[PDB]
Design a protein around this ligand. Sequence first.
Ligand SMILES: [Ca+2]
Ligand SMILES: [Ca+2]
Ligand SMILES: [Cl-]
Ligand SMILES: [Cl-]
Ligand SMILES: [Cl-]
Ligand SMILES: [Cl-]
Ligand SMILES: [Cl-]
Ligand SMILES: [Cl-]
Ligand SMILES: [Cl-]
Ligand SMILES: [Cl-]
Ligand SMILES: [Cl-]
Ligand SMILES: [Cl-]
Ligand code: NA
Ligand code: NA
Ligand code: NA
Ligand code: NA
Ligand code: NA
Ligand code: NA
Ligand code: NA
Ligand code: NA
Ligand code: NA
Ligand SMILES: [Zn+2]
Ligand SMILES: [Zn+2]
Lengths: 387, 387
Amino acid sequence: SLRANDAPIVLLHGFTGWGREEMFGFKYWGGVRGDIEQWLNDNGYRTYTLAVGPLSSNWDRACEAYAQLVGGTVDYGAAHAAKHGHARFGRTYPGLLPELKRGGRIHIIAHSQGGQTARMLVSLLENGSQEEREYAKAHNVSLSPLFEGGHHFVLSVTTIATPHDGTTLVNMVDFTDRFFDLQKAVLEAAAVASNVPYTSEVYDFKLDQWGLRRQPGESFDHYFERLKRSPVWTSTDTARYDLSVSGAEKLNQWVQASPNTYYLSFSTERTYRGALTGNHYPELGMNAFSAVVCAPFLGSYRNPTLGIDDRWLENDGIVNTVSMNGPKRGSSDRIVPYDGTLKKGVWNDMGTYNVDHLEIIGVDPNPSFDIRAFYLRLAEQLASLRP
Amino acid sequence: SLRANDAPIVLLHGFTGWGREEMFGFKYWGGVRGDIEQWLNDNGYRTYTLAVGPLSSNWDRACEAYAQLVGGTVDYGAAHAAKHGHARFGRTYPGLLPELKRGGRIHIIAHSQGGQTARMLVSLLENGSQEEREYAKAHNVSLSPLFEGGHHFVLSVTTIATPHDGTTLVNMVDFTDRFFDLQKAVLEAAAVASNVPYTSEVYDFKLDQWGLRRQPGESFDHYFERLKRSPVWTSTDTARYDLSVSGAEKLNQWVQASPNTYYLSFSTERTYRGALTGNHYPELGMNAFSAVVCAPFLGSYRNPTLGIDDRWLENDGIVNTVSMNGPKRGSSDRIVPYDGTLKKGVWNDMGTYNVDHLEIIGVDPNPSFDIRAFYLRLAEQLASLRP
Ligand SMILES: [Ca+2]
Ligand SMILES: [Ca+2]
Ligand SMILES: [Cl-]
Ligand SMILES: [Cl-]
Ligand SMILES: [Cl-]
Ligand SMILES: [Cl-]
Ligand SMILES: [Cl-]
Ligand SMILES: [Cl-]
Ligand SMILES: [Cl-]
Ligand SMILES: [Cl-]
Ligand SMILES: [Cl-]
Ligand SMILES: [Cl-]
Ligand code: NA
Ligand code: NA
Ligand code: NA
Ligand code: NA
Ligand code: NA
Ligand code: NA
Ligand code: NA
Ligand code: NA
Ligand code: NA
Ligand SMILES: [Zn+2]
Ligand SMILES: [Zn+2]
């Protein structure tokens, strides 16, 4: 295809994820398979990576993403920060693309919960926040340009394995403990132990707004026990809340597709349907943590009152596949199957791949999945988009 | 734990609550989770339910509980009735347990302000009322046995989420309108509308003494506007007066622990401490009415001169947690942390549970709280008490 835009690609992780220099250089985007950002740069697709709080709400992460792109000090909004009891200002960044203040566009490619954060960033850029604007006028405080509206610079959002209607994993009985055991399993993929008191930071959870940081001498085991009891686990201003079916529906009520952005979704599944009742079971080769800890639950949990039924049981080890083609619960967004022409302002469902939640970013091996081709094909499609 | 007594359990609601035939059978004790009295009976713990005026004083409610238990016409006392301007006599009941007049006893399990009513019932059984005794002699009128003193039929009182020292919620500026909105939120949890003039009674406020009742053609919205302007909201002979920190301390000056009764308290909390100034905020999953309307105030209102300081900020969405382990303000009662042996004549503090004020009775969902095991374990402990 012909190139029709010059927008760089920006990569955005989910409820785990870390910058290029973290985790001893093991990349979230490529894991044991390599460095996806480097593959794209090397093939002429200019690509950058964002690293935002993995456990923070999509709102917090969107404010962090905005400052990382345009430069400046993260501003969560005076109204938001007062309502949830955390700092209004966060870190200060130079900016990856401070030109976006003047003009120019990006493509966001986001995995897992990054797809919620990317959708939310577009809604804030284009429409701002009326609550923040009214609060700033009422209290005579400053207002970040993010909350003004009028700053739409995202040509496309592509989501990969995103829980747009949530994941039923949040409902599992031991979910608090098992979710932090999933963080430990991702550390272990990077050869990072959870019982070692690392002096270097290794994996920064970016919880400056809550005042939390792993302390000198503290193992990840000990630190996650503190995080389980902290506001980033127990408040509604969290990844945990937005990950749930309840909280993803609430997000979908206000975060709509912009008519100025192409949305693409990729769905993932790594399960088979059983012969007894319709439940789903992990396939050979699914990442071991998901296969043992998460997929049996995801493939069997129903909630008839919420209509969480047999269609929700197929999963990729972490998220129910039905959740991933676009927001539907609480959403008026349109979802169309890809027909060869990518359309603005709707979700173009690019299909369902037999790859698990961690294999699709290369964190878990899968030699039958040609991960480099997958990301290069996608970059060629995004470069074809007509602004 | 081996059973040591055969006393039945009697359940007692707070400033909302209704009998088993009210609310089209949606139970206060169990709500959306089921029927706690039925669970208890089906496991061999004989259990009954009281229904007294939700908005009436603890004194009125204790006279009503007395009559419902032993049988007969509610008698509020000639001196009390003349002092406050209401009828001396209320409804007539058949009596759930007339064997209490021949030696039978009960365990009361009480929620919310029910714990103040249960303590007041025990105080009146033990000591009566010298004012009533004086007045009956002076005016040559009859006297209820409740006011004589020298009676005993309560083996134990267990309080759950009770404001023994009051709740600061009453100091909210628009408390009147938000308290009746709480009543409407509880009706909505029971799938009852507030703008429909139901011909059946549905929720009887048992205001016979005040001469108030919902009229034909009157919705709950219109009825609650009248109640707000009526003596059951504007006088001192009300749940409103006894709910406040001021009124709870006045109650504690005369309602003391009996040496012949075990007292157990359960405390509840559903908040996190923020990172700005140590205020408390509602956790994810708190009932929506409390989370929006009540918890932000409860977690941020301080009054150092009245001793309302950091200890009062943690709360369950309706009552400050520090108020719930037993009466302290204006009280000489002893409170001891449970140590595996329950003690008579003192408050056995059974701990604090991460469950909100409505979750603890099942009116609001919380799948992580095993409400059936909670009540069954409590009934087994009460059955183990030595008589
Ligand atoms: Ca694999
Ligand atoms: Ca709840
Ligand atoms: Cl180190
Ligand atoms: Cl810390
Ligand atoms: Cl950290
Ligand atoms: Cl099956
Ligand atoms: Cl591989
Ligand atoms: Cl007994
Ligand atoms: Cl008694
Ligand atoms: Cl009337
Ligand atoms: Cl705070
Ligand atoms: Cl539940
Ligand atoms: Na505040
Ligand atoms: Na840290
Ligand atoms: Na499959
Ligand atoms: Na298949
Ligand atoms: Na929809
Ligand atoms: Na109904
Ligand atoms: Na808490
Ligand atoms: Na005291
Ligand atoms: Na819990
Ligand atoms: Zn926030
Ligand atoms: Zn009265």
